Design a protein around this nucleic acid. Sequence first.
RNA 1: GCUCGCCGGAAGACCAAGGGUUCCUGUCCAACGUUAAUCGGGGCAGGGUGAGUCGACCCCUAAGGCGAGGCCGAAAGGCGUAGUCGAUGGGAAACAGGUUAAUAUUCCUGUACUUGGUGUUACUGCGAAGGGGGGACGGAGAAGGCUAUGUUGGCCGGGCGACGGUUGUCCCGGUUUAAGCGUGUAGGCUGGUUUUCCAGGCAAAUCCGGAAAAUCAAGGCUGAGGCGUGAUGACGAGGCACUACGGUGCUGAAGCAACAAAUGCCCUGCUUCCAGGAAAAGCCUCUAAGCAUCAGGUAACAUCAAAUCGUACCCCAAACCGACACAGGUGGUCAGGUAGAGAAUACCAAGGCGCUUGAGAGAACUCGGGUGAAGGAACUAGGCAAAAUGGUGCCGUAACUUCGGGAGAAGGCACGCUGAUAUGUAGGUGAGGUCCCUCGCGGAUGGAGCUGAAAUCAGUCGAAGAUACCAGCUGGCUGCAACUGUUUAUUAAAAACACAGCACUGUGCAAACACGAAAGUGGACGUAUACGGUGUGACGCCUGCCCGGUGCCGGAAGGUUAAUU
RNA 2: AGGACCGAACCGACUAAUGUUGAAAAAUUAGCGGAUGACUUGUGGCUGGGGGUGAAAGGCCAAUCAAACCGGGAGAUAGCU
Lengths: 93, 46, 271
Amino acid sequence: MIREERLLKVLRAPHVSEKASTAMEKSNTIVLKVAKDATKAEIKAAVQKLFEVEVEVVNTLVVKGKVKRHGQRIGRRSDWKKAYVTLKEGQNL
Amino acid sequence: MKRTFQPSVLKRNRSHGFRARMATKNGRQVLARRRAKGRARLTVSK
Amino acid sequence: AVVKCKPTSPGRRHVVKVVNPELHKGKPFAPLLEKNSKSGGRNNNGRITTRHIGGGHKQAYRIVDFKRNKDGIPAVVERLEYDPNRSANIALVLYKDGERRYILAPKGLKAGDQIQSGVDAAIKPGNTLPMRNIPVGSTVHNVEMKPGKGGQLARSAGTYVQIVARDGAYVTLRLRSGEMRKVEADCRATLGEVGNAEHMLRVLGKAGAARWRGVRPTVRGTAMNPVDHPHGGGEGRNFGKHPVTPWGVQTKGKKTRSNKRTDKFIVRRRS
RNA sequence: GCUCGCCGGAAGACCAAGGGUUCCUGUCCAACGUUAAUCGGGGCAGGGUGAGUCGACCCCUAAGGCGAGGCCGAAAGGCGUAGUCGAUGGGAAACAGGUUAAUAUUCCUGUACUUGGUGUUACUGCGAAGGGGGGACGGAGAAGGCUAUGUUGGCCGGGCGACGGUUGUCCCGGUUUAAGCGUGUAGGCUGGUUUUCCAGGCAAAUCCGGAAAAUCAAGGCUGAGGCGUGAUGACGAGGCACUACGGUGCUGAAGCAACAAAUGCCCUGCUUCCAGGAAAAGCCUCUAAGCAUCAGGUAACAUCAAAUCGUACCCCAAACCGACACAGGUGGUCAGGUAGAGAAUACCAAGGCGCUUGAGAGAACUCGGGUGAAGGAACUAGGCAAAAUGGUGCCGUAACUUCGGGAGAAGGCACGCUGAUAUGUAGGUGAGGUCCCUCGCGGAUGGAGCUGAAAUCAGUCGAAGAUACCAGCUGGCUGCAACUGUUUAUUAAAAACACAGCACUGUGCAAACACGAAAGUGGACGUAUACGGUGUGACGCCUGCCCGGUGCCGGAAGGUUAAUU
RNA sequence: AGGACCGAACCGACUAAUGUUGAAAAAUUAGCGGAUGACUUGUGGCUGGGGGUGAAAGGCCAAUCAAACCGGGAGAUAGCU
Ligand SMILES: [K+]
Ligand SMILES: [K+]
Ligand SMILES: [Mg+2]
Ligand SMILES: [Mg+2]
Ligand SMILES: [Mg+2]
Ligand SMILES: [Mg+2]
Ligand SMILES: [Mg+2]
Ligand SMILES: [Mg+2]
Ligand SMILES: [Mg+2]
Ligand SMILES: [Mg+2]
Ligand SMILES: [Mg+2]
Ligand SMILES: [Mg+2]
Ligand SMILES: [Mg+2]
Ligand SMILES: [Mg+2]
Ligand SMILES: [Mg+2]
Ligand SMILES: [Mg+2]
Ligand SMILES: [Mg+2]
Ligand SMILES: [Mg+2]
Ligand SMILES: [Mg+2]
Ligand SMILES: [Mg+2]
Ligand SMILES: [Mg+2]
Ligand SMILES: [Mg+2]
Ligand SMILES: [Mg+2]
Ligand SMILES: [Mg+2]
Ligand SMILES: [Mg+2]
Ligand SMILES: [Mg+2]
Ligand SMILES: [Mg+2]
Ligand SMILES: [Mg+2]
Ligand SMILES: [Mg+2]
Ligand SMILES: [Mg+2]
Ligand SMILES: [Mg+2]
Ligand SMILES: [Mg+2]
Ligand SMILES: [Mg+2]
Ligand SMILES: [Mg+2]
Ligand SMILES: [Mg+2]
Ligand SMILES: [Mg+2]
Ligand SMILES: [Mg+2]
Ligand SMILES: [Mg+2]
Ligand SMILES: [Mg+2]
Ligand SMILES: [Mg+2]
Ligand SMILES: [Mg+2]
Ligand SMILES: [Mg+2]
Ligand SMILES: [Mg+2]
Ligand SMILES: [Mg+2]
Ligand SMILES: [Mg+2]
Ligand SMILES: [Mg+2]
Ligand SMILES: [Mg+2]
Ligand SMILES: [Mg+2]
Ligand SMILES: [Mg+2]
Ligand SMILES: [Mg+2]
Ligand SMILES: [Mg+2]
Ligand SMILES: [Mg+2]
Ligand SMILES: [Mg+2]
Ligand SMILES: [Mg+2]
Ligand SMILES: [Mg+2]
Ligand SMILES: [Mg+2]
Ligand SMILES: [Mg+2]
């Protein structure tokens, strides 16, 4: 059983985009920004407990952070993990 | 024409990488020289 | 059988091959096979220590019984086989107890013959006996040098050893080199000559045939530069030196044996 | 947007490596882009990579690395045992359709599959670090069965033609569908079963090996493809309906057959050859210590788990390696039409491009080409370069020869199209029908339909029929090297090196020899028909004299002679 | 059957021209040799500088080779410019 200490830290932000809205309006799927070491089992346990919906399946991917320039200075944004959480057909979070 | 540098990440790490440097005393002296100069990159590992 | 190829191409004109229809055409006996990958003449320092070794066909090692220890148990020859590791052919034998084993195939031994080792064996080819039980004057092969060590002398195709005298605990052997050697009389030996005596009548015919056997080309010292070889140098073809090895030791007549430990067993050098 | 041109065994498509946001959208044109740029692989901002099955990780090992102890070495360290790493190899499982501006075997729809944990119900000898089996292996060749795929007809939809003709032996398009499951075929291999006994498999074995039997004659293994199902589905020419003129939405016919056919599959086969062709695990099985009405094994249903990381884009290239948006380099997969022997070549398809300066002019001269009177090597160091020859079938072919060659020697003839033989032949393929059946994915007979060389005769057009592209110049004397090979990466490819063969010589195995303060290691898991060194260089006929010099080998009496005493 | 024949891929580099501040620090075009083998090629490994490796050209060992490269002795020494 995943500790509630851990569950309150894995979910970071909703991800807002046109792909994220289509996935909600067509496939009952929320797109989340999650912690970089969060597993698929942790994301499922945290969505079901904190958002109080029922989760079909979690798919994840790691977004590689972009190289940017700021005032002739090379930088690089952080990598982050995205999660496509499919809900069970009647939840509508 | 075939030039001298034909990259291979596996061969780059086994020949010049951090664990190859740490494996001999002569390679540990390379790292000691590069830390004393203050190199931002000790090895080809990054 | 010795058969001359027909000159249908210049690399075939001189090939003489030795075809033995008795040798088993199928795969070898797999419990007696091991791996042996090649060295290229390199030692564990990775240096070339024997020149001219490299490539050639892949070969599996055959575990050959040189010791012949299963005494008092009859064995029957199942088949003669090709062995890529050696000049002689080998013979898969079936002991009566169910164990299979490879031996060197002596001259005149075929499938169905009976062989036996030990002190109580008859005197006929393929049998292995301590040499004090073998008569003086006999032709033997696969001869041990230390009792129980396994046979080390007269193993190549067509070779044999004559027992010329037995003086107490030693026997005197005439080796194939012409050398007279004392060996302890309890050392085992197998009666008869080694088979495949037509082995030395093959003619390889072409350069590639030696490359199939792992022999890489020999460059003459006189074709080199002075930095390479003591024979190198000169404008045009020149020699002017006494002939030496690549390491400067004289190579036409200079004797190189120095073993005072085993000198007491050498009755006469080979001349 | 219409036309034109170029590639099409690539200049298309897709991976691996390598790169790392170059991907997609909006916005901007300073710099970058060999010009301008509204455009961009440029700036700026936002978006974008979804996996139990693909790969990595993982289990297993190769070469090799590292290596507890150990052995060795002034120190640093060297080697190496047990072990432990190491893929370029072995090991579980997913396909079709749809969808985004940008991902998809990952999302969705449909239909599947694998392995492990649990909980059970039921029969139960389970159990390894050990045994055995298996995995498990070369080259070449030969043909049979196939499929991918194509072509033609049938089918269905549309057409009736800008200029003479075109209701027809007319035109255009489509005619697609997977993994899985069921069947176990063409074919390949193997004699099955049950007892008895045993010096073998480090001990045990009921397993493997061996000996004897009795009996049974087909039991087992493997296997492309077809067929059925998957599929009343999906896809589908088009038609329609909106268009933010980018494409969406809806609707939807036929969806068969015959022939041709691979380098792909059966096939890790079969045949044959000598140069004799990985390992280990998963898997099958065997018992041991232990466990012993338990745990555990096995089959079934159910139930949970299958994490993590990669996934965008380029990838024969403007994104990799070449300082460049550089005529260079870069492993693997896919492989349509007509002609063709073909992956050559020409023109095309799908698909992609016109190579990031243009506009004129129409001097010399330079580059890349085309043609040339008469002559035809007079050129020149030299026929350098160019010109020429060039296909298939048949006729014909010298010296010499090691009997294979030389030889495609040389030299010649035929070649298009149309008709007949024959409305399409020899051949290939094979339906219906038929019969028999150890009852089928069967056999035998039968030939409809399909496909289809080449020959001869006749006729016919042109200057020319291998019409383009493509595609040997030939012969004579002679040096040298036998030959195929190899070499100065970047001015030398040869007569140089190598070579098979030959000889001398060393070497008796803890071999000579080599690498190494050494331990060791190669030589070699070889053993004088073997291995090292040296010279010579196929083959043929041969290889004469000299031991004074220098070297090597043997001798061992005498002279000379070290440390030591 | 064959280090067999002809010939693409693939590997090589005989001749010529071009190019020579190149398109290219070794290439392009047209020809040319091998093309089942002593063949070619991917990935990984091993041999290290008086050392390696060499079908031997003093070849090659990262555009460097009759002794690599980097750092050090080092401001070597220079009756020479
Ligand atoms: K010379
Ligand atoms: K040096
Ligand atoms: Mg899913
Ligand atoms: Mg993922
Ligand atoms: Mg040699
Ligand atoms: Mg030789
Ligand atoms: Mg030379
Ligand atoms: Mg010298
Ligand atoms: Mg001379
Ligand atoms: Mg002289
Ligand atoms: Mg074209
Ligand atoms: Mg950028
Ligand atoms: Mg773009
Ligand atoms: Mg401007
Ligand atoms: Mg500009
Ligand atoms: Mg951009
Ligand atoms: Mg190892
Ligand atoms: Mg130690
Ligand atoms: Mg070690
Ligand atoms: Mg391992
Ligand atoms: Mg691999
Ligand atoms: Mg894409
Ligand atoms: Mg077909
Ligand atoms: Mg082929
Ligand atoms: Mg992709
Ligand atoms: Mg350009
Ligand atoms: Mg380029
Ligand atoms: Mg290539
Ligand atoms: Mg072409
Ligand atoms: Mg002009
Ligand atoms: Mg001109
Ligand atoms: Mg002309
Ligand atoms: Mg003229
Ligand atoms: Mg004329
Ligand atoms: Mg003339
Ligand atoms: Mg003249
Ligand atoms: Mg003149
Ligand atoms: Mg010419
Ligand atoms: Mg020409
Ligand atoms: Mg002359
Ligand atoms: Mg030659
Ligand atoms: Mg040649
Ligand atoms: Mg050169
Ligand atoms: Mg040259
Ligand atoms: Mg040894
Ligand atoms: Mg000669
Ligand atoms: Mg010579
Ligand atoms: Mg050939
Ligand atoms: Mg070369
Ligand atoms: Mg060329
Ligand atoms: Mg030739
Ligand atoms: Mg050829
Ligand atoms: Mg020279
Ligand atoms: Mg160089
Ligand atoms: Mg020097
Ligand atoms: Mg000094
Ligand atoms: Mg100075």
